[PDB]
Every structure is written in structure tokens, then in C-alpha cells.
A and B are shown apart, each in its own frame.
Chain A
């Protein structure tokens, strides 16, 4: 089914699973036209498909050419997401195929179920968790690869860098969702927190800086403080 805190390890049972976020598939800018009407212009987007246990991210880049001459684009985007996820599963060896696919938005259930009819043993499910994966585009190396693409393209990342050498995936996913929630709430301040100290750098083959254990505790504190700060600014608390 749909998931909860009433199992804080059922989403984390032992099966290969993937989280599929479609927020950033169809992206537009809205602008006035010479005649004073309004028009959209699409820009490149991406499907965020993530394994919680391993950190492997299958970033499918959605080139704007996909939309050319098509109608009802918000609806098509859900069906294109489902098609690309289904094609990813079929490309993986059987022993790497997922036992569960978990969509961050309920509107993806029917399109992904219909595309995956040939895989009756793969459960397609929603989640009550509010995951901040829409902020994936605030990660500079992912935004850069999406906006430079000139053609459809799939790019593989480990979104936890080398963290699993030192922490559990439960803790790594915790760190990731706190980082993305902060970037979603106040992008500039979150980035200021992550980069301020220039003696800590981002390895060329990483997405995040090379913090020691003690520095990550500090950085995590500053992210919790930013989120609280913004909650205060928002509600006048």
C-alpha cells in the first residue's frame, strides 16, 4: 500500500526499491507576448529515480524536443515518466530489478501501473512522506548536466558520495532529505552554509563537500536552524 511511521522499516524491509519523483519532468517559464498575451517556453527537465539503500540515482534528462508538437503536456509528462521508468526496469538485469516502485505524487500511480502490467510482481505504491526531491535541481552538478543537454540522455550518480563508508543508509537518507528540505526552503542560505568555508571542497567526483564526521554534525545543525528560522519568518513566530 501507501506508507507511514507505523512501519518506519517497511519502506525499508530488504527489497530492491526505487523512489520516482516527476516534479521536474515538465518545466516552463511564463512570459508576456508582444500582443500582451502570455506564453510558456519549456526548458530541459529530469526524472529523479533513486535507490534509498544504495544512493544510486538514475537521472533521466528530458530534452525539450520531447514536447514539440504535443498537446496536454502536464498529462503527457506523467505518461512519459512512466514509459522511461518502465524502460529503465527492463534494461536492468533481473536480479537488479526493483520489487517496489514508490511514487512521490499519487497522480503517477495509474500511468506507472499501466506501463508495468508486464511486471505483476513489482508493487507500485504511494507514500505519506513529504520528500523534498523537487529540490534536486538546486544541486549544482545535476542542474548543470540537465541544462547543458542537447539530446535525451541518462546520467548515473551516487547522491550520497562516499557517506556509506561511515554511516548507515538510514542516516544517509536522513542527511539527504534534510539537505534537500533546506535547499527547498531557502536555497541561497543553504548553499551559503554548505560552501562558506573554502578549506572544505567538493571532490571532482562528488556532489557535496568533503566534511568530516564532526563537520557534518555542525552542518546538519545549521540546516535544522535554517529550517526553523524560515518557519519563524513564515508564520511570524
Chain B
């Protein structure tokens, strides 16, 4: 297991760790999170009690360094840092653990939820979407725009998702206009999978990351990207059978985890009806269709 200690908690804040969350009171003796399962990425996220503006947070992997949190009263936020003195870090943590000033990451042993949401998500691929090379961890917040959003504006602080545009020359081969516009298989299989992503695992990782950014930070740019990558698959007549099966699992766990009270803003009615009921893969998403129909029949 691994640990993210906090120097202190000087402002009241709701802290999230993956899909879990808890409240810390102003100057309460909180010194971080322990028993974090090694082997997956994680995200620690914040929403200040006195200013719900700016959800923000940090994607990290405890195998790539020792990270702690410290409040910066100038920039007004909880910042992730890396401690390079390992023995110092171990000494600090043991003291906080001995004094039981840390919350335990609350993993139920029947529960595969976080594995199922992050199966294909890899810290090295996150750091190419979120460009801040001098850190081993990656900051994301509510307001960061995507490269595509900044085409339709500080490029250093953007989300470099792969741009998907069904009416672009990249999606449409000259001489195959009707064919490629009504059937996206060329764009999916040659341009995106063979060309840009190299394999389906990297495509699903970007997809999963887009969903998690949208749900944990209320990032509109991420929500757009998630839906675009789903629609690109569903709108293709020719998709490997292994991809369709795995996509049904991916979406099933995302719908299952979405807070019901946020469904109105996190699910695009148009895109989901097309994918489930009109598209080439209308019949290929049995588990996702069933949970969507039992949980969010209003959207349909």
C-alpha cells in the first residue's frame, strides 16, 4: 500500500480520492490518506467549502514517486508536491500513522469499481494529454479547455485530447464522401486506431480518462470528448468483436457509477439515443442498454 500525507488542512474542503469522498473541517487535524492500492492510477480532488468555484485535482501513481499535499495560501489551493528525500518521507508518514491522523482508502474486497473505470488508463498517457513535464503527477480542473475547444485560450493549460471531427478532411476520403460520412469505419480503424492510437487499449484509456475528468471536475471539454469517442465507434459498421464487447463493459461501469443527480448534465440525450437505438451497433451494447433503460429511462 501507499500514502499521500498532507502538511495540514487550513481551509474547509471536500476531498475526493477516486470515487470516494469526505469532508475536512477548517484546521481539523487531518494529515492525509493511507492504504491506497498500488497498481492503479488514482486522482485526489478538491472542492473548497467556501467557494465551490474550481473543482481541481491531481492524477498520480504511487509507484512513480512519493507525493504529498500542502496548502499554498498565496494561490489559494491544495498543491501536490514530490518529496525526493525518501527517508524523510517515510519518517513523516510513520508519525502521522502512529498518531492516526490519516483516513484509510476505503476499499471493499468485493469491489472492482476502480479497476473497472481505469483498466486502460496509464499515467504515461495522461502526461501527454496534460502537459507539465517537470512533475510526475498531472493537475486538471473544472475550467481547463481542450485543444479542440481552443480552435473554435492559454495553450499551456489545455487538455490535449485527440481531436475528432466527423466533417473534416481527416475523417473523409476524397471520392468516398457518402461512404465515409454514413459509415465511420475508415476514420475509426485506419485514421484513429492504426494511425493515431496504435491500438484499442490506448483509445479506451483516453475514453476512460475523458469520462473521469468530466465526472470528477465537471469539465465540459472532457464530456464532449467522451461522447465523441463513443459515437465514433457506434457509427462504424466494421469494428472488431473484441472492441465492441469491451466497450459494453466500459460504459456499463461508467453509467453504473454516475451520480443520478448529475445525469441531466453528464449524459447527452442525442448521442445516447443514436448509439443505442439508431446506430450500426444498436444491438451490440446489451449490458449498457439494460442499465441505461433501468436507471435513466427518462433520457430515452
A residues near B, CB below 8 A?
76, 79, 82-83, 110-111, 113-115, 117-118
Contacts and interface: CB of A to CB of B under 8 A. Distances in A.
Q: Which of B167, B172, B177, B181 has the most CB of A within 10 A?
A: B177
Nearest to A120: B169
A114 B171 CA distance: 10
Chain B contact-residue range equals under 10
A114 B181 contact: yes
Contacts of A76: 178
Nearest to A115: B177
Nearest to A72: B182
A75 B168 CA distance: 21
Contacts of B167: 110, 113-114, 117
B181 A117 contact: no
A79 B177 contact: yes
Contact of B172 (A79, A82, A83, A114): A114
Given A114-B181, A117-B169, A118-B174, 14 more contacts: A79-B178, A82-B177, A83-B177, A110-B167, A110-B181, A111-B177, A111-B178, A111-B181, A113-B167, A114-B172, A114-B177, A115-B177, A117-B168, A118-B169
A82 B168 CA distance: 16
B291 to A, nearest CB: 32
List 5 tightest A-B contacts by C-beta distance, closest first.
Answer: A79-B178, A114-B177, A114-B181, A115-B177, A117-B169
B174 to A, nearest CB: 8
9 contacts: A79-B177, A79-B178, A83-B177, A110-B167, A111-B177, A111-B181, A114-B167, A114-B181, A117-B168
Interface string B209-231: 00000000000000000000000
Residue from A76, A79, A110, A117 having most chain B Cβ neighbours under 10 A: A117
A117 B181 CA distance: 12
Nearest to B181: A114
B172 to A, nearest CB: 6
Contacts of A114: 167, 172, 177-178, 181
Contacts of B169: 117-118
Nearest to A79: B178
Interface in B189-211: none
A82 to B, nearest CB: 7
Interface string B159-190: 00000000111001010011001000000000
Contacts of A113: 167
B165 to A, nearest CB: 11
Nearest to A76: B178
A117 B187 CA distance: 16
Contacts of A83: 177
A82 B167 CA distance: 15
A114 B175 CA distance: 11
Contacts of A118: 169, 174
A231 B168 CA distance: 46
